């Protein structure tokens, strides 16, 4: 949808909006064909040599017209193979198949034809639902996932000049209840809900408003409509069964911000940053939870969140891992070394280690707290034990004319 296309970079001139839309439509068509590949190979392996028409239908619903033609030819269906060879680029052929279907229905010959075969002719004619003379409804989309259903709308139901937004709108009408027909397409559920047999019992209109859509449909809507709601798109429930998994939602928000989408409310941005930082804190990647919090636009909220996380997770014990995390914060994240030392001073106070507290207050540039701690609690013990070098290390550094 948004990435660099090699075909658009090969032109020295600014590519016309029509050429951009055509190459984007081809890239999206290739994406749809690749998403169906694993499932079509499974389906074709199951149908065997006896159900060659169902295997031909499966290849057509993946855009693999050449392999559908070869399978039909190998199975001895030379008439179907000839028909399929003519489908690449002729609108006239689609109209002739549509006339042929109408004539079979008028003559009541359609009832003697296998349903799977009529379904192939319906697909090739660009008719999504066909009513046979026997009052049987042949639905092309009935056995398709929402991705193959959308692909059939893009390849067979629309002209080769049609935009991604036109294909999406036609697919949306296909699963909505309308005065002109029964819904014939599946609703675009997330993949963890695709196998949930949600029995759509007799009241479907009130249930679709509660059913989360796949993140891919939300992205296709955002591409078609620049003002589409980002709150639904960035909800974890569009991707995962776990409502606490903010991994994809947070990274999508960073990419959408890089694409100049800015219409996400500051409150929802704050929720995404806080939820993903809390997920990383629980996994023990709290140094990366700081990185996530550093994306917060508001300086005071950002600063408060970073210091709060440092105060919780900063360890006073020098392990090679703790020092690697500190080096990551200071050198890669550019976090002030002062704040890391302040957090270590607060932790040393909790642990009762007044020596380490004084050392980290000194390194943290907290001169007044350091001086009060040294004078009240370290000076008397150092004088009584004659440890003058120890008291001189703190008081010597504090004695600098800029600190005094």
């Amino acid at each position: 949808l948004w990435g660099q296309l090699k075909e658009l970079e090969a032109s020295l001139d600014e590519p016309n909006e029509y050429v951009r839309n055509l190459e984007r439509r081809k890239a999206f068509s290739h994406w749809l064909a690749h998403t169906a590949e694993e499932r079509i190979e499974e389906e074709v392996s199951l149908y065997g040599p006896e159900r060659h028409v169902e295997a031909v239908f499966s290849f057509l619903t993946g855009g693999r017209i050449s392999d559908a033609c070869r399978l039909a030819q190998k199975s001895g269906d030379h008439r179907l193979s000839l028909l399929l060879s003519q489908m690449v680029g002729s609108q006239e052929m689609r109209e002739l198949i549509s006339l042929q279907l109408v004539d079979w229905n008028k003559l009541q010959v359609d009832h003697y034809i296998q349903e799977e075969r009529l379904r192939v002719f319906c697909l090739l004619s660009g008719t999504p639902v066909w009513r046979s003379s026997d009052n049987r409804s042949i639905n092309v989309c009935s056995q398709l996932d929402w991705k193959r259903t959308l692909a059939v709308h893009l390849w067979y139901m629309l002209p080769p000049t049609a935009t991604i937004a036109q294909a999406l709108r036609l697919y949306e009408r296909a699963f909505q209840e309308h005065e002109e027909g029964e819904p014939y397409a599946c609703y675009p559920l997330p993949p963890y809900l695709e196998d949930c047999s949600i029995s759509l019992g007799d009241e479907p209109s009130a249930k679709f408003s509660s059913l989360q859509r796949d993140v891919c449909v939300h992205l296709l809507k955002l591409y078609s409509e620049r003002q589409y709601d980002l709150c639904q798109l960035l909800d974890p429930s569009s991707v995962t069964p776990d409502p606490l998994d903010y991994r994809l939602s947070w990274h999508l928000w960073m990419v959408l911000q890089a694409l100049n989408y800015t219409h996400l409310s500051e409150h929802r941005q704050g929720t995404l940053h806080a939820s993903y930082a809390a997920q990383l804190e629980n996994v023990g990647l709290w140094e990366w939870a700081i990185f996530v919090l550093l994306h917060i636009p508001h300086p005071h909220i950002r600063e408060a969140g970073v210091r709060e996380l440092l105060n919780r997770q900063c360890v006073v014990r020098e392990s090679p891992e703790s020092l690697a995390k500190e080096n990551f914060l200071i050198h890669r994240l550019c976090v002030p070394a002062q704040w890391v030392h302040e957090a270590k001073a607060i932790r040393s106070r909790r642990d009762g280690d007044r020596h380490k507290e004084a050392l980290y207050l000194l390194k943290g540039h907290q001169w007044n707290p350091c001086h009060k701690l040294v004078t009240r609690h370290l000076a008397a013990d150092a004088v009584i034990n004659e440890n003058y070098r120890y008291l001189q290390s703190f008081l010597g550094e504090l004695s600098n004319p800029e600190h005094c």
Binding site: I198, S199, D202
Partner: protein, 798 residues
Amino acid sequence: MRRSKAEIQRYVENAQNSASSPREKSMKGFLFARLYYEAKEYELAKRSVSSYISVQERDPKAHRFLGQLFEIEGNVEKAVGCYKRSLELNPTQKDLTLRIAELICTLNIKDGRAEYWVERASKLFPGSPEIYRLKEQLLSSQGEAGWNQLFDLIQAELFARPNDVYVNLKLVDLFLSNQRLEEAVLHCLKPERRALRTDIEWCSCVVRVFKEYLASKQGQKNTNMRMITKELLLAQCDVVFLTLSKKDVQKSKEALERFDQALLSVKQSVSGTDASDLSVTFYEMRGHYYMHAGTLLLKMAQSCEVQWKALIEPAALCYLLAYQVPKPKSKPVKGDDNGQGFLEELAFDRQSKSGHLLLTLSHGKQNFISEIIETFANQCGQSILLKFLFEDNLSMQDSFMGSDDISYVENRVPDLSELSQHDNGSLRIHNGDLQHLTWLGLQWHFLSTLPPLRKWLKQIFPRVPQETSRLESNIPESICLLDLEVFLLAVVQTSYLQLQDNNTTADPNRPRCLPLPICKQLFTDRQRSWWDAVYSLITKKALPGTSAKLRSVIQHDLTTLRAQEKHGLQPAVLVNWARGLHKTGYSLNSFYDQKEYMGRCVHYWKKLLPLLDLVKQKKSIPEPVDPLFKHFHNKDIKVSEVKDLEDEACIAFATLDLVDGKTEDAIIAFESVKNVVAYWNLALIYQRKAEEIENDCLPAEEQEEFQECLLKCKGFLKMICDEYSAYPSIATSLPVPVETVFEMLDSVKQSLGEAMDDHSPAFMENHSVLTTSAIKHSTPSPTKLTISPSKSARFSPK
């Protein structure tokens, strides 16, 4: 596409197999119930919503929906129970309180719950007609105690709604049930009841009550009996009129027969010398009887019971008899204008209708009225008329028509000036009804004469300004008489075109326009809704609380009438408005009125010019999905006609500059068009310039200017004569008869004297200098009054 039971059940089974808990299955139950209801599977809908209610007991929508399912099954008590529960959970559902009251009254009126629910509904919807009906049903069950409360309820509802036909009928029936016939009569005689005369059930009830009263008092010579007999003849006439419009031919025959017998019964009591109010009403009602008889004959021809040819002459005799009935001679008795002015208004309405129908039925035949009098104004013609109307049901002696003298009929063709006066009288009874106005406008249009819409609109809307300075405003309070005039001109034109397209296969003897009672709706429901909104707002007759909705209707379609952005008008409508306004404005002697009409004419020409450019480019004109005025493709402007319309627009611009007193700019503009109409306007300008110079003692310089003006006038008049001699078809484009051009040319020759006939200076060789600067016809933008006093307007209207 209705989902099949099997599709819904597969969807429900899949949605139930995917649910992790019994609670989650039941939470989807409301959606399943709605799907089963859309499939008419009410038992499965009930099970699905009951399974939802057992998990979500506090959802008002589920209890409401369960009540609807029980109501469809006819289980009223369970429905009322579910609706009560929904109303308890959400009291904002005022509609449910009314539905509970209706259902309880339907189940058992003697239920003490019914009074509570009806009174609770009455507090939520004060003055609802449905609550009045429920209270009527309750009180009708309570005997004598119910009677007094029902009387008080009816008086309260009549105070809130005096024009409700149903409540007025119920009051009369309640007087009749208590043998209070005198009060039923007194209630029918109330002057506020004149508004109910448009309803057939009311007029039939009034007729019934008055007949019963007159029967009960037979033998008492009371002044009240003459008054009730007068109002009975009026109410019978209304029943005939309403039956002619709203019922079939057979019911119209029976209504006219009852009116015939009523007139016959009164004829013996009316001696021809008595100037009594009953005698005046009897002769007025005789005229209405014949007008309605002629209308019934044309109705029988319209239903294909009889051929048009056989009923035209008999119907024309009936309209002749109706037209010739003398108007009631008003003695202005100082003090009670409400009774006698009404019979005069009826007489004007009869004379207008009958006179226009005589002109329609004659098809322009000069001797038509004479042929009808000779053929049918005799006892044999009466016997033929009686047979057409009543077949063998009435004898010549048992009929008013058979006993009436029709032999004394004058050979009087309706005069157009008298008809225009009668039309102004008829407008008072119809109160600005759009059907009446459109019908009159069509009658004048079939005569090729402009309807006097300005006079009609000033009578209907006496407080509306003639023009507005804010044509770009769409505010309803900015409406002017010119907006209403162009609306009526377009309605009349669109009605005329619609009658032509429907008449291309009609009998040559069929009247071009039918009488109002039997005439189809001449306008669209949108044109009705706009006119009724304007009328209700301006006359302050709008119902309380409706005024915001009425303003929105007006504001939308006022943009169309003013030809604002995206107006969606057909060009032919703009041409008709500009022409209608040009002709009306030119015929007015008032400078201010001429300027307003010419200013508005020029406004529509300026809006039409860009559409003529589209037609010249062979581009299609945008048509609205629901237009205020229908587009008629038989009147689409042809590319050949575009030049003549551009020249007509230029003439209208030059005429406005002339009316503004910019005489020199107008001369230059007329000289540019080079058409007979422009030469005629140039001749008139130079004649007026010569008459302004004509004072009995001119200086030699003013004598040369006078002679130059007369020579220029002679020049342009000669060009008109020379063009007319080449093409006699030009007589149709001339604003005046060609005789007036010759008379003016001969007067100008007499004033020039014989001594100048041999020196024509080459009238066109010396003005070949001034190149192309687009003359911007600027209307002044509103720059603040700076009074500079030094040009007295030189233009007095002599």
